[PDB]
Structures are given as structure tokens and as C-alpha cells.
Scaffold this active site. Structure first.
Site, PDB file in Angstrom:
ATOM      1  N   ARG A  54     -74.822 -41.595  20.576  1.00 13.09           N
ATOM      2  CA  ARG A  54     -74.942 -43.024  20.727  1.00 13.09           C
ATOM      3  C   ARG A  54     -74.160 -43.399  21.970  1.00 13.09           C
ATOM      4  O   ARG A  54     -72.940 -43.214  22.024  1.00 13.09           O
ATOM      5  CB  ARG A  54     -74.365 -43.652  19.467  1.00 13.09           C
ATOM      6  CG  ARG A  54     -74.486 -45.164  19.406  1.00 13.09           C
ATOM      7  CD  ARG A  54     -74.092 -45.660  18.012  1.00 13.09           C
ATOM      8  NE  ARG A  54     -73.669 -47.048  17.982  1.00 13.09           N
ATOM      9  CZ  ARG A  54     -74.497 -48.082  18.114  1.00 13.09           C
ATOM     10  NH1 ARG A  54     -75.787 -47.933  18.422  1.00 13.09           N
ATOM     11  NH2 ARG A  54     -73.996 -49.291  17.961  1.00 13.09           N
ATOM     12  N   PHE A  59     -69.873 -49.926  27.390  1.00 15.96           N
ATOM     13  CA  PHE A  59     -69.182 -50.140  26.134  1.00 15.96           C
ATOM     14  C   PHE A  59     -68.589 -48.828  25.688  1.00 15.96           C
ATOM     15  O   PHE A  59     -67.366 -48.701  25.766  1.00 15.96           O
ATOM     16  CB  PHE A  59     -70.185 -50.699  25.098  1.00 15.96           C
ATOM     17  CG  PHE A  59     -69.625 -51.012  23.703  1.00 15.96           C
ATOM     18  CD1 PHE A  59     -68.261 -51.250  23.489  1.00 15.96           C
ATOM     19  CD2 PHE A  59     -70.487 -50.927  22.606  1.00 15.96           C
ATOM     20  CE1 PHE A  59     -67.768 -51.309  22.198  1.00 15.96           C
ATOM     21  CE2 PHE A  59     -69.990 -51.001  21.313  1.00 15.96           C
ATOM     22  CZ  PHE A  59     -68.632 -51.182  21.120  1.00 15.96           C
ATOM     23  N   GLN A  62     -70.466 -42.186  22.080  1.00 15.81           N
ATOM     24  CA  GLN A  62     -69.998 -41.763  20.775  1.00 15.81           C
ATOM     25  C   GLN A  62     -70.590 -40.415  20.360  1.00 15.81           C
ATOM     26  O   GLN A  62     -71.799 -40.192  20.483  1.00 15.81           O
ATOM     27  CB  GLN A  62     -70.389 -42.869  19.801  1.00 15.81           C
ATOM     28  CG  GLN A  62     -69.818 -42.761  18.388  1.00 15.81           C
ATOM     29  CD  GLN A  62     -70.218 -43.954  17.534  1.00 15.81           C
ATOM     30  OE1 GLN A  62     -69.921 -45.094  17.864  1.00 15.81           O
ATOM     31  NE2 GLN A  62     -70.876 -43.785  16.395  1.00 15.81           N
ATOM     32  N   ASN A 101     -65.944 -45.119  12.536  1.00 13.77           N
ATOM     33  CA  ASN A 101     -65.740 -45.076  11.084  1.00 13.77           C
ATOM     34  C   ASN A 101     -66.763 -45.959  10.451  1.00 13.77           C
ATOM     35  O   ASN A 101     -67.589 -46.563  11.161  1.00 13.77           O
ATOM     36  CB  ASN A 101     -64.314 -45.568  10.655  1.00 13.77           C
ATOM     37  CG  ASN A 101     -63.904 -47.007  11.031  1.00 13.77           C
ATOM     38  OD1 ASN A 101     -64.657 -47.963  10.832  1.00 13.77           O
ATOM     39  ND2 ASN A 101     -62.737 -47.278  11.606  1.00 13.77           N
ATOM     40  N   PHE A 112     -65.326 -42.162  19.808  1.00 12.42           N
ATOM     41  CA  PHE A 112     -66.054 -42.719  20.935  1.00 12.42           C
ATOM     42  C   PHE A 112     -65.066 -42.882  22.090  1.00 12.42           C
ATOM     43  O   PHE A 112     -63.853 -42.960  21.905  1.00 12.42           O
ATOM     44  CB  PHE A 112     -66.715 -44.078  20.574  1.00 12.42           C
ATOM     45  CG  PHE A 112     -65.808 -45.169  20.002  1.00 12.42           C
ATOM     46  CD1 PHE A 112     -65.406 -45.115  18.678  1.00 12.42           C
ATOM     47  CD2 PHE A 112     -65.344 -46.186  20.837  1.00 12.42           C
ATOM     48  CE1 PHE A 112     -64.481 -46.011  18.201  1.00 12.42           C
ATOM     49  CE2 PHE A 112     -64.422 -47.096  20.363  1.00 12.42           C
ATOM     50  CZ  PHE A 112     -63.981 -46.993  19.043  1.00 12.42           C
ATOM     51  N   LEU A 121     -62.123 -54.337  18.945  1.00 10.50           N
ATOM     52  CA  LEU A 121     -62.066 -53.267  17.982  1.00 10.50           C
ATOM     53  C   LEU A 121     -60.632 -53.011  17.607  1.00 10.50           C
ATOM     54  O   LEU A 121     -60.404 -52.147  16.760  1.00 10.50           O
ATOM     55  CB  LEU A 121     -62.666 -51.983  18.544  1.00 10.50           C
ATOM     56  CG  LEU A 121     -64.108 -52.003  18.994  1.00 10.50           C
ATOM     57  CD1 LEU A 121     -64.383 -50.712  19.714  1.00 10.50           C
ATOM     58  CD2 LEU A 121     -65.042 -52.173  17.823  1.00 10.50           C
ATOM     59  N   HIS A 125     -60.241 -49.766  14.529  1.00  6.50           N
ATOM     60  CA  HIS A 125     -60.488 -48.365  14.854  1.00  6.50           C
ATOM     61  C   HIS A 125     -59.221 -47.757  15.387  1.00  6.50           C
ATOM     62  O   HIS A 125     -58.593 -48.403  16.235  1.00  6.50           O
ATOM     63  CB  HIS A 125     -61.570 -48.271  15.898  1.00  6.50           C
ATOM     64  CG  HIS A 125     -62.956 -48.683  15.384  1.00  6.50           C
ATOM     65  ND1 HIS A 125     -63.764 -47.836  14.777  1.00  6.50           N
ATOM     66  CD2 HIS A 125     -63.598 -49.890  15.451  1.00  6.50           C
ATOM     67  CE1 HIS A 125     -64.871 -48.471  14.466  1.00  6.50           C
ATOM     68  NE2 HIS A 125     -64.754 -49.698  14.880  1.00  6.50           N
TER      69      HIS A 125
END
Length: 164
Positions: A54, A59, A62, A101, A112, A121, A125
Site C-alpha cells: 500500500r 503520505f 506500507q 495497526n 509504514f 496519526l 500509531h
């Protein structure tokens, strides 16, 4: 003194380059040993041969799902899941290495790499390392992802292990 690990990245088999990450075992030791042991592979399983499933440009990139290769699997060296160790470190800019997660205290093996400050975030995270060298290789991988994260090419961790 803090461990360093590397991943060698390949795009459909063609070598791209090497990313090395410094892991803050001094601040998030359980989380950082978990990523260190999966990079060397020393407990029997780990990241070698798995893909970045991903990548959302601007951004994050991952990967870490070495069992189901799409975001639905992975496991830690401690069990299917483990707790959020702490939230001392924050997502201050590109190069941050943080755990992905599925809710409170569900860390496994997915991680990531931020290519932007992603302050939304923080406290959700667990940040545990950062890019020491090869940020330009993360930028180059970022060019193969898309708005929903599907990748154009298979981005795999061809090799990985420790350096310091």
C-alpha cells in the site's frame, strides 16, 4: 548503538536500492526488537521476500504483511498482536517509521514509512525508527503507488538484515 537495519528494494525483480533504518530501541524497545528480529529473520520468519502492499504518494509506503501479502496478515515475534508500547515519539516528518495497526493494541508486523509529516496519526500509531540512508529510494517507491494504495509494480524487500 541504536541498531540499524536495511532493506534492499526491487521493483518487479529489478533492484532499486537500499534503505537503512535506525531503530529507537532506547525509547520503544519491544517494538524495535520486533522489527529487528523480522528484518534479520532470526526467529524463523520475517520480512525477506515480502512486498509493500500500500503506497499512497505524499503520505506513506506500507509493507510488513508477510503472510497474506495484502494488508490482512503478518505477525509479531510475540504473538499475533501486541500492545501499543508507548506514544513518546511523534510523526514529525518524512522518514518516520511507525507501526500500522487495526485499532488499540493490535500491532503485528505491518509498518509504514512516512513521506510527509502526518501529525494526525500521533498517539494512534507507535513510532519506532527512522530512515538513516536511502530516503531517495523511499521517494522512488512512492512513485509506484496510487490514491487508494494499489501498486503498479510489485515492490518487494529482496533482502534485509542488520548493519549496526
Amino acid at each position: 548503538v541504536n541498531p540499524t537495519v536495511f532493506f534492499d528494494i526491487a521493483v518487479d525483480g529489478e533492484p532499486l536500492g537500499r534503505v537503512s533504518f535506525e531503530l529507537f530501541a532506547d525509547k520503544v524497545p519491544k517494538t524495535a526488537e520486533n522489527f529487528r528480529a523480522l528484518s534479520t529473520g532470526e526467529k524463523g520468519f520475517g520480512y525477506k521476500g515480502s512486498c509493500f502492499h500500500r503506497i499512497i504518494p505524499g503520505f506513506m509506503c506500507q509493507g510488513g504483511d508477510f503472510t497474506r501479502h495484502n494488508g490482512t496478515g503478518g505477525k509479531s515475534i510475540y504473538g499475533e498482536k501486541f500492545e501499543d508500547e508507548n506514544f513518546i515519539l511523534k510523526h514529525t516528518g518524512p522518514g518516520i517509521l511507525s507501526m500500522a495497526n487495526a485499532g488499540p493494541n493490535t500491532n503485528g508486523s505491518q509498518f509504514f514509512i512516512c513521506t510527509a509529516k502526518t501529525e494526525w496519526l500521533d498517539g494512534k500509531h507507535v513510532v519506532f525508527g527512522k530512515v538513516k540512508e536511502g530516503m531517495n529510494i523511499v521517494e522512488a517507491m512512492e512513485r509506484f503507488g496510487s490514491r487508494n494504495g494499489k501498486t503498479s509494480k510489485k515492490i518487494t524487500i529482496a533482502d534485509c538484515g542488520q548493519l549496526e
